[model samples]
Target: MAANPYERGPDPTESSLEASSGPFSVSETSVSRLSASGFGGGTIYYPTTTSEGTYGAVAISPGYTATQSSIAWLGPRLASHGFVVITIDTNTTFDQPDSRARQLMAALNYLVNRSSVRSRIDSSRLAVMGHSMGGGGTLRAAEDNPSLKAAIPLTPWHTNKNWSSVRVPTLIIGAENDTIAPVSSHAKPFYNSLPSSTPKAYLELNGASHFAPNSSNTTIGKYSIAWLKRFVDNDTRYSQFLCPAPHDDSAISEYRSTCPY
Candidate 1:
C-alpha cells in the first residue's frame, strides 16, 4: 500500500492544532441560497494548494433557527488543516433534527458533485457535523450515511437515543453548563448509544454553554482537527494527539474515548 498517501500539512504539535489556522493558506467560495437545492447554500473553505493532493470534505450545519453564520468559524479553521469544509444554512431555519440531517447530506452532495471545488475533493472521504439540533442531526446523518469517514456533534440535541446503527467514527462534544442540551441528558446518552465497534469519543467543555461552539474555541478546534485528521485523512501521524485521551484542562472539563485509534 502507498504509505501516508492521505497525509497533509506539517507535523502536528500542541501549538500547531491550537493555532487559528494550519500550514495551508486558505480560501473560500460562497454558495448562495438560490444556487442550491434541498439545503440553503453557505460557504466553502479549502486549502489553496493543488500541489499536494485531493483532500477529504466535510459539511457543517447550524442549530435550529440559526443561519450558517452560527457555525461559520469552523469553515476556515478546519479548511486550513487541508480539508474542503462547508458551513451550510438549512432549507429553513426552523428545520428539525431529521430534516437537518437530510440537509447535511444534501450539502455534502453539492460539495462533492456540484461545488466549484469538486475536483479538489475525494468524494469517498466525506464527513458531516452540526450544532444543537444540527448536532443532533449529525448523528442522524452519520447513521444514514455509513460511507462517512467521521462525525463530530457539538452540544447535540436529539430525541432518539439509540444510535447503534451508526458505524462511522464519531466524536461528540458537549458543553458542561448547557441547559438547552445538558451533558447529562444529551451528549452522554448519545455517546453511550454509539456502538463500541466503531471509534467514538465524548468531550465536555468546561463551563461552556450551548452557544460555545458558535464561536472560535481552542479546545473544540484542537480535537475536532485531530479527529478529522485521524479518521477523514486516515493520517495516523495525527494519532498521537488523540490516543491516550486528552487530559481535563482549562478548556476541557471531561473527556472519554476508545484510545489507540
Candidate 2:
C-alpha cells in the first residue's frame, strides 16, 4: 500500500525545528473509544512529535480513582521528546489488578489494530509506565507479554515472587514519603530481583508526596523527554542524560531512567 499521506490528525510536516520540541509536533489529538464488550470507554491522546517512521509509544496507567488525566501531564511532554504517548483508563479502579491488566491488553490491541498506527509504531520499543495501583498492572502486563521493551512503576502495589523473574529492563521510581504504596512493598524487591543481564534501576526521591504528578513535584516532567528520547529514539547517550545526574525538575523537566534491555 502506498503511504497513506493522509492527514488524519496532527500534521507532522508543517512543524519547524526552530519551534520544534524535537520529535514532537505541537498538534496533539485526543480520541476516545468504547469497548464493544461493554466494559465502557477509554481515552487516547496521540502526540506525534517525530515522524511516523520513528514512532515509539508510552502506555500509561493511573493510580486508583485517578482518571486518564492523571498521566496527561506526561503525554505531551513525551511527545516533546519525540515520541507518541498513550494514556489509558482501565474503565475500573487501578486497584483491581487483574481487571486493569485486561483493560490494558484491550487498549494495546486497540492501538495496534489501527493500520495507520500499526505501520508507524515501533512495537519492539514500547514502554509501559504506571503509578500506585496501576503500577501492579504494569508489572502484570510486562510479565504476560514479551513484546514489552521497558517498564516504569512509580510506587507500585503488589510484590509477588514472580517480580524477581521479570526479564524486561525496568525503572522503578518511588517517593520516600509516599504512604499509599511504601517502597518496601514491591518496588525495592522488584528492583533488586531484576537479573543482571537486563538493565534495572531504582530511585527514591525524598520529601515527594504520593500525588507527585498531581502536585507536579515528581521528576517525570523533568527528564521524561530525555528518557524517551534516549530510550525510544535509541539515543545511545540516554544513560548519560539521566545517570550519575538527574535532570532539572519542572513541567518541562521529567525524572526518568533507561534500561538497556
Candidate 3:
C-alpha cells in the first residue's frame, strides 16, 4: 500500500511551531448569497499576503442548533496557515447530518466560484471539518465525497455508526468527558470502523468536554493545521508533528498509524 500520508510528515504539533500562528496574516469577509443553489451567505477567511499559488479550501459546519459563529475560530486559525476557510450556516440548524453534508459541498462550490480573488484556492485540495452534529456531517460528507483531501470531526454525533468503508484521510477528535457523544459510544467506534488502509487518527482529550472542540485550543488547532497541510496541501513538513507523540498537556490520549520514520 502507498505510505500513509498521516504518518509521512514531521511531527510539528508538539514543536515550537505549534505555539504560534502560521506563515500568513488572515482576512475575512462575508460572501454574498449564492444564486446557483442558494448556497452562499457564509464567512470567508483567507491569507492577506499575496498567494503565489492556489491554497487549499476547507468548508466548516457548526453543530446542531449552532450558527456559523460557533466555529468561527477555525476560520482565522486555518486561513492563517495558508488555507481558504469557509464557515457556513446550514440551510437550517435542525438539518440532519446528510443535509449538512450537502451544505458543506455547496459551500465549497460557492467558494470555488465566488472567491473575490480568482484562483486564490487550489480547487483540488479541499477538506471538511465541524463540531458535534456538524462533526458527524463532516464524516458523512467525506464518505459521500471521496475526493476530499482530509476530514476532521470534532466530538461528532450521528445515528448511523458504520463508517468502515470511508477511505478519506481523517482525523477524529473526541472529547473524553463528552456525555453527548462520548468516545466510547461514538468517537471511538467511528474511528475504529474506518478501514485500516485509510490514513486516520483518533485523539481523545483528557478532560475536555463536548464543547472543547468548538474553540481554538492550541493543541487542536496545531494538529488540525498539520493534518490539512500534510494531506490537503501535500506538504511533508507537517509529517514530523504527526508521530512520536509530541509532548503536550493538551493531548490526554492519541492514536495513529504506525510511524515508519
Candidate 4:
C-alpha cells in the first residue's frame, strides 16, 4: 500500500457527496452450480454501465450455518456502485473460518479468471467481506493475502481473535446488541489486533443485533461502498465518507479509524 493511498483522485470538497449506490444499475449471473475442488459455486453481480475502465471486484460470504442469500444484498448494492461483487456459498455451512477464507478467495479467482464477467473486472483491485464466521474469514483472507484492496467484516465471529498480520485496509462493522459474536469478545478485539499502521475503521451500529449486517441498512451500504471505493477502486471521491465521515448519523453509535478523510 502507498504511504498516503487516499491522496489522489477527485477532490472530496469539490465533488458531490452521495451514498455508495452510484449511478450504475446492477446485473447478476449465477457463476457456478455446485462445489468444485473444495470451492463453492456462487452468483456474480456487476454494473450495467458502459464505463470504460476495468472495475474493482469483491467476494462476500455468509455466516456459519447460513447460505449465500444471507449476504445477497451486498452483491447488487456494491455492484451498483461500480464493482464486480460475488456472493458465495460455502461447500458446507459448517465450514470453519479458514475454510470460508479459501472459498472466498476461490470465488475471487473465479471472478477474475474464469467467470463470464472476467473481462470487465480488474483482478488487481480485489476485496473480501463476510458476516459472522465468514466475516472472520474475510480478515483471515486479508491476512493471507495482504495485497487485498479492502476487507469488510460485519459482526464477525471467531474464537482466535488474533489478526495482527492483516495489512489490508479493513472496515470492521459491529452490532452493538449482538450476543452471538459479542463486540467485546470478537469484533472490537479483532479490530484492535490489526497492526496500527493498517488503515482501519470500526463502526458499531446503535441498538443493532447480530443480523444487522444482513439487512438492507442504507448506513451499511454507505460506509461499505466508501471503504471499497477508497481502497479497492482507488477513488478518492469516496474518501470524504471514509475519513472524517462528513457528518455522523444517529444510526452509527460509535466509530473510530486511522483513515484520513
For 26-118, candidate 4 gives per-residue lDDT tens digits of 888886656343577788899776444678899999999999889987887788767889888898889999899998898888888788789
Candidate 1 local lDDT, 1-261, one digit each (tens): 448789887778889999998999999998999987788998999999988999999999999899988999999999999999999988888899999999999889998889999999999999999999999999999999999999999999999988989999999999999999998988999999999999999999999999999999999999999999999999886776787445424477678777657
Give all candidates' CA lDDT scores: 0.92, 0.60, 0.81, 0.83
- As a whole number from 0 to 100, the lDDT of residue 176 in candidate 2 is 79
Worst 10 residues of 4 by lDDT: 8-17
Q: List the residue pairs that clash in candidate 1.
A: none
Ranking by TM-score: 1, 4, 3, 2
Which regions of candidate 2 fall more than 4 Å away from where they truly are? 1-23, 33-40, 48-52, 115-119, 159-162, 215-218, 245-261
Query: Looking at candidate 1, what is the lDDT of residue 4?
Result: 77
RMSD of each: 5.2, 8.2, 6.0, 6.0
Who wins the lDDT comparison? 1
TM-score of each: 0.92, 0.75, 0.86, 0.86
Deviation from native of the Cα of residue 135 in model 2, angstroms: 1.1
Which portions of model 4 show Cα errors greater than 4 Å? 1-20, 35-37, 245-261
What is the lDDT for 47 in model 4?
79
